[PDB]
């Protein structure tokens, strides 16, 4: 299947409290493998995956220098946007950047990622053509005009098609054994008499990796989608995830309903019913 390498940059200002907090978090697919944090005991690039320990000191020195270099650039950009918008210096503002590339099985570049965000609103973003920009507001037009006369779009396309892909290939082969590792969801169905003259069946799914999972309730071979209370997948804290589906069924009809657990770590989708001990 397809894969991607994305870097999540955070830049939050703190007026009268010191220099802005700077963060760089890399993601091979959905897995965090590197992290840099200015507000830490020691501001250096730290591995987040045990398969990144293979890289030598030469690698962790380059990325650190690049991180500090980036932090200074964003420290300026935080002040620069105060001028574009004509805002006050007393307020704390946030810059967020998502940057990376998605490469398919064929090795072909599928997506070029480069989007900026100021205070949660979209600011500027590299289009699919990898040559033009989409400015989300009046102030971004200033940035856009600067990047046109500087040819930033062309310099950026080079990184996306070249550098970013080369490193994705390297990261993938350096940790493919662990990236493929999957934990099977351990499922069970609980029972509660919460509604009046009715009950509630809650199908659980615990200790699974990755977060990709599908839980459905069925009756007469048909899925209950609107009648299904589904909660967001959450972390258990140990590296795995949890999720459950609730459905309100009439009393005495518990056995007529079945839960289904779909996951890539399962040889066969799980089928569960309510069962009293």
């Amino acid at each position: 299947g397809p894969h991607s390498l994305r870097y999540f940059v955070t830049a939050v200002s703190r007026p009268g409290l010191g220099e802005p907090r700077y963060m760089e978090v890399g993601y091979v697919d959905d897995t965090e493998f590197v992290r840099f944090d200015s507000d830490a005991e020691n501001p250096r690039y730290e591995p987040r995956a045990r398969w990144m320990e293979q890289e030598g000191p030469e690698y962790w020195e380059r990325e650190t220098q690049k991180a500090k270099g980036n932090e200074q650039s964003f420290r300026v950009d935080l002040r620069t946007l105060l001028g574009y918008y004509n805002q006050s210096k007393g307020g704390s503002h946030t810059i967020q950047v998502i940057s990376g590339c998605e490469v398919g099985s064929d090795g072909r570049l599928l997506r070029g990622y480069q989007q900026y965000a100021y205070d949660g609103c979209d600011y500027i973003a590299l289009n699919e053509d990898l040559k033009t920009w989409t400015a989300a507001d009046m102030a971004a037009l200033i940035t856009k005009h600067k990047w046109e006369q500087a040819g930033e779009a062309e310099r950026l396309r080079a990184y996306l098609e070249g550098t970013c892909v080369e490193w994705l290939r390297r990261y993938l082969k350096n940790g493919n054994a662990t990236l493929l590792r999957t934990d099977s969801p351990k499922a069970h169905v609980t029972h509660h008499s919460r509604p009046e003259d009715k009950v509630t069946l809650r199908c659980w799914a615990l200790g699974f990796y990755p977060a990709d999972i599908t839980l459905t309730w069925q009756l007469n071979g048909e899925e209950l989608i609107q009648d299904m209370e589904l909660v967001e997948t959450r972390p258990a804290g140990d590296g795995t995830f949890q999720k459950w589906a609730s459905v309100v069924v009439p009393l005495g009809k518990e056995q007529y309903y079945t839960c289904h657990v779909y996951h890539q770590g399962l040889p066969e989708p799980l089928t569960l019913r309510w069962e009293p001990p």
Binding site: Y7, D77, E152
Partner: peptide, 8 residues
């Protein structure tokens, strides 16, 4: 390897 960002 992340990219060397350009100023706004």
């Amino acid at each position: 390897s992340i990219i060397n960002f350009e100023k706004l």
